[PDB]
Amino acid sequence: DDDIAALVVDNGSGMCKAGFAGDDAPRAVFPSIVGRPRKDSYVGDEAQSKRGILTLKYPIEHGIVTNWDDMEKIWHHTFYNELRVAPEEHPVLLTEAPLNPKANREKMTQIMFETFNTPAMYVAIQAVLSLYASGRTTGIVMDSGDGVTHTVPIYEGYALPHAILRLDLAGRDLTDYLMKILTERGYSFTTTAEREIVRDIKEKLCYVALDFEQEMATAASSSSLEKSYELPDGQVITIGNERFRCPEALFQPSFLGMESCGIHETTFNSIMKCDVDIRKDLYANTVLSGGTTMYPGIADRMQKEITALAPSTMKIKIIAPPERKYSVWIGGSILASLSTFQQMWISKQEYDESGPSIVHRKCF
Amino acid sequence: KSPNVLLQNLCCRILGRSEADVAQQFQYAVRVIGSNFAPTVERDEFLVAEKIKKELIRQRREADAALFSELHRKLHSQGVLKNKWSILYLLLSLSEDPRSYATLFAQALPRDAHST
Amino acid sequence: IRRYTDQRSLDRSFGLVGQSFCAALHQELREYYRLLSVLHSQL
Amino acid sequence: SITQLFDDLCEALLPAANRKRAKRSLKKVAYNALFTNLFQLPARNKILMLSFDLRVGGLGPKADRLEELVEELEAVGSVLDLLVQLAGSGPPRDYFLNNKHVGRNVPYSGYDCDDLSVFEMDVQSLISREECLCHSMIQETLQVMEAAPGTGLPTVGL
Amino acid sequence: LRRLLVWTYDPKIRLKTLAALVDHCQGRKGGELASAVHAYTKTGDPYMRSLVQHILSLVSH
Amino acid sequence: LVHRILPVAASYSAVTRFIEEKSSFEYGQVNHALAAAMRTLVKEHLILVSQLEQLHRQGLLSLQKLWFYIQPAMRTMDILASLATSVDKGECLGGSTLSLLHDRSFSYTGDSQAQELCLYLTKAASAPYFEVLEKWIYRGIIHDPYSEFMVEEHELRKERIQEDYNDKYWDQRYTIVQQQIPSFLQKMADKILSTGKYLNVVRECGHDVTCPVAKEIIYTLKERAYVEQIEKAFNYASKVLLDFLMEEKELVAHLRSI
Amino acid sequence: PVLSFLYRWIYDGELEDTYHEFFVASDPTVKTDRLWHDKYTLRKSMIPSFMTMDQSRKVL
Amino acid sequence: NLNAVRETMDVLLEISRILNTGLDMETLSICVRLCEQGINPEALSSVIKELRKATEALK
């Protein structure tokens, strides 16, 4: 190149993504599973392989850390076994979840400087870092992950946390609710492995439609909507009518029995807390993001809701990348490539001279 | 100024309506003034003065025909303008009565005896 | 080559393909005459 | 995706026959200048303003071609504001002008004799192309006739 | 300009045709003259046709 | 070297006589406009000689440079010179002189310079011909100041010429010439006579032909518009004549009485 | 020009010359209804070498 | 839409070719898509102009 190489390692909420900044795809995708018997010093590929008598746990699930030992441990074993590189030749951009406390930022930076060992560091809010890859510094990001989902409004490179609305409904609630309805109707879901496999089936094959009612009536008069998949496991679970209406609980809390805010109302309440002069400027760049693009078709519903959200006397102008599975990755990958970003990136010496809390101060 | 936007300044002068409220009149003016912007005629503020007299005599105010003769003296007394023909010929073009024939009256050369 | 393309220029029973080959040969010999033209002034 | 759209911009505008590290370093400059700007009257009117400057320099039907094409181009407005900035920077016959012996419905205006002397400059341009070529054959060899052994030749460098 | 052969080629055809009408008509007066211009309006050359196309409009006023 | 340059002067010396002589009245009506369209290419030939002499003053022109320059004219004028000598040698007027150009316009297509000169010359020269074609086809009147058209007129509706003294006027009164077809209306030659035959026996009844079609005939090559044009007019004339025949003085009643 | 002849042998029409630079060698006086058999002999000598036999026979 | 967007791309190719822009077909389609996302044109005008100087010092 012309300068010292970059590194981006973000421990997300269902996965750890690593690699060198300057690639469209991450170099390495790992699980964020933490091993404990239901290994104990080996985490990642080995813990996911010995799963079945080993618990599945993520160190962050609500967008705030539930157990600090697990995060510090997966972070240290990320640096020691998964990559095995020299720290002084790889500055790392870390990304914590949005709406993390200031003490969490202090905890992340002490841990990144001591157990993880980096020569200069930066920790950022997630969806903002993703939007900086979308070629603008203004916009609204609806980020939907494994653990939670949240609409981050971001104007001029900065998210006000008062207008970031956290919503529980995510892929975990979708899988949990699938398990609940199949086992309530009568189906053996039994073990944690079969749980993971049926989650794989929902993630990959599922047909998601924009109209439920017409497709429901056609499937109820003559069912042919199915498409069978028989794995090396041997299980055959498919039904066409349930798989498009199972994620409808995102805008319909009464499908479980829940009383909650829906997704359109969440983004409505979020846009209410942004100023109306920047509402147009933000509305001129609406992004599609989130790992739920493993099957596209929820994204069409998402863009219909953002068209209906603001008043239509101006046409939607939507930034739709060819892939948004790696949205958080391509987010940090643009940032660590920048050379002017080294002046807003904090060193070890500034971290030592002005306390550990200056990572909350330097980070805008 | 730059001559392209300077037309739009006139178009926004007469009607105060925006340059996004109408675009055909403005297009019609970029049609008409371009290829008729640079002169293809030989200039004469002399000949135009001698018909400005003939216009103000036609309104039968002889003192004002002598008032223009002094204002024209002032115009040369300063010497801050190069093309003194054009604006007077313009204001002559927009003449109007506050209260025949012209091809037998002098007009300038259309460059049919001079070409470069 | 000058000989060859000169007899086929006034040979019009040489057909529509041969009179295209010869039309190309005209243009190549034009470029061959360009050089001697520059050399003549230098003489 | 957008991290590739500046890189594909970087490849197409780079020709070929170092320059293998430079592409990857120039997409870095592409992002480094994207966020220098972001930190710190219709669209068709600018096209009308450039067509006017065509008409002042002659070439009327060309300006009329520009405008008949932007009237159908109204059916992109964020592309033209970029297009007008690269319309000034560049890279680093017809027989019906003066003929009346064709047609049956053909104008009568008589003579012109106001640009018929600039109808002979029409021929002066053609002869001025084929005389500037013979000036660019005599110089590229007169730079060779006066030279010295192995000053531009690396064959002495062996 | 090689004795201005360029500028002398626009005449010597417009001039020639109008040297004929003033020979061909040598004393006709009345509608016998508008029969002597209406026989030049069916000449196959579009130069000469367009030139007598305006002469006939003038004389028939 | 001065022998090598003479063909372009030879292909000029045999055209200027042609342009002067065959634009006189006696040579047809199309032989006029043919020579009149070769005047545009002589203007260029004049400005060449002048511009060359103006380069000669500073000594930046010589024989070899000029020999290098005169190469496009040596071909382009040679085409028109052969055309001029061939029309002069024979009696090519009307359709025959418009057939020759239609032959040269195919004899070169693989170069497409020796096509373009002829393809322009054809549109230019056939203005008077298509103006005869603009009368016979859309009206039941034809004029032809110089009768050398493919249709030829005779007058056999007269004071002493009777309905059984001319019998049937189709192939007798209005007749078609075989060699004055310009060899691209040959495909429609029968129709070209019959269209204008139909139109005049409608002029006898009604006030005028009253045509809605009225389109200008232009030259094309390779997909002809001047065939589709003839087809539309040939439909309208027969429609009007048939409508008139079965409505007024109807042949149902006249045969029923027989 | 060969591919120009081939535009009158991918559409209706017929090249006529005595220069014979095209593989079609037409046969007069047979237009009865049997010309879907034989009206067009395939002259091999005017077939170009950038056209295969498969190319110079399907066009027939 | 697709035929109309093909036609509007073609007309957009013609008016940038007679204005003699250094760009080509592919980079036009790239720039058109970048403005179709909502990216500021004022920033793309810098990167094209600095690339088109900086790529020649390499060759």
Curated annotation (Swiss-Prot), chain C:
Residue pairs linked by disulfide bridges in the UniProt entry: none
Tissue expression summary: Ubiquitously expressed.
Localisation per UniProt entry: Cytoplasm, Cytoskeleton, Microtubule organizing center, Centrosome
Protein role: Component of the gamma-tubulin ring complex (gTuRC) which mediates microtubule nucleation. The gTuRC regulates the minus-end nucleation of alpha-beta tubulin heterodimers that grow into microtubule protafilaments, a critical step in centrosome duplication and spindle formation.
Assembly and oligomerization: Component of the gamma-tubulin ring complex (gTuRC) consisting of TUBGCP2, TUBGCP3, TUBGCP4, TUBGCP5 and TUBGCP6 and gamma-tubulin TUBG1 or TUBG2. TUBGCP2, TUBGCP3, TUBGCP4, TUBGCP5 and TUBGCP6 assemble in a 5:5:2:1:1 stoichiometry; each is associated with a gamma-tubulin, thereby arranging 14 gamma-tubulins in a helical manner. Gamma-tubulin at the first position is blocked by TUBGCP3 at the last position, allowing 13 protafilaments to grow into a microtubule.
Membership in a protein family: Belongs to the TUBGCP family.
Name listed for the protein in its UniProt record: Gamma-tubulin complex component 3
Organism of derivation: Homo sapiens
Lineage of the species this protein comes from: Eukaryota, Metazoa, Chordata, Craniata, Vertebrata
Covered residues, full protein: 304 to 346 of 907
Swiss-Prot record, chain D:
Subcellular location: Cytoplasm, Cytoskeleton, Microtubule organizing center, Centrosome
Implicated disorder: Microcephaly and chorioretinopathy, autosomal recessive, 1: A syndrome characterized by microcephaly, cognitive impairment, underdeveloped retina and choroid, and epilepsy in some patients. The more anterior parts of the retina, near the periphery and pars plana, have a grayish hue and diminutive vasculature similar to retinopathy of prematurity. Visual impairment becomes evident during the first year of life.
Function of the molecule: Component of the gamma-tubulin ring complex (gTuRC) which mediates microtubule nucleation. The gTuRC regulates the minus-end nucleation of alpha-beta tubulin heterodimers that grow into microtubule protafilaments, a critical step in centrosome duplication and spindle formation.
Assembly: Component of the gamma-tubulin ring complex (gTuRC) consisting of TUBGCP2, TUBGCP3, TUBGCP4, TUBGCP5 and TUBGCP6 and gamma-tubulin TUBG1 or TUBG2. TUBGCP2, TUBGCP3, TUBGCP4, TUBGCP5 and TUBGCP6 assemble in a 5:5:2:1:1 stoichiometry; each is associated with a gamma-tubulin, thereby arranging 14 gamma-tubulins in a helical manner. Gamma-tubulin at the first position is blocked by TUBGCP3 at the last position, allowing 13 protafilaments to grow into a microtubule.
Organism from which the protein derives: Homo sapiens
Part of the full-length chain shown: 3 to 195 of 1819
Swiss-Prot record, chain F:
Functional summary from the UniProt entry: Component of the gamma-tubulin ring complex (gTuRC) which mediates microtubule nucleation. The gTuRC regulates the minus-end nucleation of alpha-beta tubulin heterodimers that grow into microtubule protafilaments, a critical step in centrosome duplication and spindle formation. Plays a role in neuronal migration.
Ranges that cross the membrane: none
Tissue: Ubiquitously expressed.
Protein family (similarity comment): Belongs to the TUBGCP family.
Top-rank taxon: Eukaryota
UniProt protein name: Gamma-tubulin complex component 2
Source organism phylogeny: Eukaryota, Metazoa, Chordata, Craniata, Vertebrata
Protein location: Cytoplasm, Cytoskeleton, Microtubule organizing center, Centrosome
Assembly information from the UniProt record: Component of the gamma-tubulin ring complex (gTuRC) consisting of TUBGCP2, TUBGCP3, TUBGCP4, TUBGCP5 and TUBGCP6 and gamma-tubulin TUBG1 or TUBG2. TUBGCP2, TUBGCP3, TUBGCP4, TUBGCP5 and TUBGCP6 assemble in a 5:5:2:1:1 stoichiometry; each is associated with a gamma-tubulin, thereby arranging 14 gamma-tubulins in a helical manner. Gamma-tubulin at the first position is blocked by TUBGCP3 at the last position, allowing 13 protafilaments to grow into a microtubule.
Residue span relative to the full protein: 259 to 516 of 902
Organism name: Homo sapiens (Human)
From Swiss-Prot, chain H:
Annotated GO biological process: gamma-tubulin complex localization; microtubule nucleation by interphase microtubule organizing center; mitotic spindle assembly
Cleaved signal peptide residues: none
Family: Belongs to the MOZART1 family.
The entry's keywords: Acetylation, Cytoplasm, Cytoskeleton
Binding partners and assembly: Associates with the gamma-tubulin ring complex (gTuRC) consisting of TUBGCP2, TUBGCP3, TUBGCP4, TUBGCP5 and TUBGCP6 and gamma-tubulin TUBG1 or TUBG2; within the complex, interacts with TUBGCP3 and TUBGCP6 to form a luminal bridge with actin that stabilizes the initial structure during complex assembly. Interacts with TUBG1.
Top-level taxon: Eukaryota
Protein name: Mitotic-spindle organizing protein 1
Main location class: cytoplasm
Residue range from the parent sequence: 17 to 75 of 82
Function: Required for the recruitment and the assembly of the gamma-tubulin ring complex (gTuRC) at the centrosome. The gTuRC regulates the minus-end nucleation of alpha-beta tubulin heterodimers that grow into microtubule protafilaments, a critical step in centrosome duplication and spindle formation.
Gene Ontology cellular component terms for the protein in this record: centrosome; cytosol; gamma-tubulin ring complex; interphase microtubule organizing center; spindle
Compartments (UniProt record): Cytoplasm, Cytoskeleton, Microtubule organizing center, Centrosome; Cytoplasm, Cytoskeleton, Spindle
